Amino acid sequence: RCGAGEPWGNATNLGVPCLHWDEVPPFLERSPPASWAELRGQPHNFCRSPDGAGRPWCFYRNAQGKVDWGYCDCGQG
């Protein structure tokens, strides 16, 4: 039950949980496609959509200690 454009919430697409936007390390492993400082979900974690294509995505933190970003479509990655 995953339509494109609809985020899973706190999981990059359908995999790794979204870390908090203010908890994103200044030295990041992935480069973000857009300036997300205005996603303004800093206090919390939840997919955001900087892309005018209606494509939500968040930063996921995995058990490797990594924090990267992924599209939240639950089937578009």
Domain of 63: which CATH number?
A: 2.40.20.10
- Residue 16 per-residue DSSP state: S
What is the domain count for the chain? Answer: 1
Instruction: Report how this structure was experimentally obtained.
Output: NMR
Beta strands 48-51; 67-71: pairing state:
unpaired
Closest by Cα among 60, 65, 73 to 4: 73
Provide the domain limits for residue 16: 1-77
How is residue 30 written in tokens? Answer: 């992935």
Asked whether 67 and 25 are in contact (CB, 8 A), the reply is yes
Q: Give the C-alpha separation, 62 to 10, whole Å.
A: 12
Find the distance separating the first CA and the last CA of the chain, reported in whole Å: 16
Q: Return the bridge partners of 55, or none.
A: 51
Asked whether 72 and 17 are in contact (CB, 8 A), the reply is no
How is residue 70 written in tokens? Answer: 């992924």
- CA 66, 24, 69, 30 torsion: positive or negative? negative
